[model samples]
Target: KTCENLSGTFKGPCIPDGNCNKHCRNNEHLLSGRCRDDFRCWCTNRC
Candidate 1:
């Protein structure tokens, strides 16, 4: 499933998918994240 919150934010540009992924896992201990729709960060994990 996908989570839009998880306290993740990539409010700038879609610099790299890994940047979002790294932030989610490191900052919130989440599985990962992606850059979507104006660089918004969307966290994800197995449901």
Candidate 2:
């Protein structure tokens, strides 16, 4: 499935993919995440 940004958990520029993924997994309970081109953290799960 496609990824969606968890706007509540993260804001501003996203530097590292690992950091973004961590926040999504820990806070939002998403499966994974990535740093998008728009400088945001986008999260996804097993859909």
Candidate 3:
């Protein structure tokens, strides 16, 4: 499953998928991440 990255540091206008992925994995402890079309970071992980 995936969820929006709600981290306070994960501000809007998400650009780099690599950065988002890192934040999700390291900061949010998620499996992975992607920059959505809406310019938001979305994290993937088991629900």
Candidate 4:
């Protein structure tokens, strides 16, 4: 189940090929289905 509290998880093709649905475009906070699995959190403020 997905969270409906604030927003939807951003999904993309070049997002490292995983089941990651929770993400932010602006900050690029890529969080996986399990939890934090990011090797290097490349959080960006821009698209």
Q: How many residue pairs clash in each candidate?
A: 0, 0, 0, 0
lDDT of each: 0.52, 0.55, 0.53, 0.31
lDDT of 1 at 32: 61
Q: By lDDT, who's the top model here?
A: 2
Give per-residue CA lDDT, model 3, range 1-47, as digits (tens): 45455332354444434366665566557766544333455666766
For 1-47, candidate 1 gives per-residue lDDT tens digits of 55444322343344344466666566656666543333466666654
How do the predictions measure up, each by TM-score? 0.37, 0.39, 0.37, 0.18
TM-score of 2: 0.39
Off by over 4 Å in 4: 1-22, 26-38
lDDT of 2: 0.55
Question: In angstroms, how far off is 34's CA in candidate 2?
Answer: 3.3
Ranked by lDDT from best down, the candidates are: 2, 3, 1, 4
Top candidate when judged by TM-score against the true structure = 2
> Is 2 or 3 the stronger prediction by lDDT?
2
- In model 1, state the lDDT of residue 44: 68
Against the true structure, candidate 1 has what lDDT? 0.52
| For every candidate, C-alpha RMSD to the true structure in Å | 6.2, 6.0, 5.9, 10.1
What's model 3's lDDT at 23? 58
Regarding lDDT, does 1 or 4 come out ahead?
A: 1
* Lowest-sum lDDT 10-residue window in model 3: 6-15
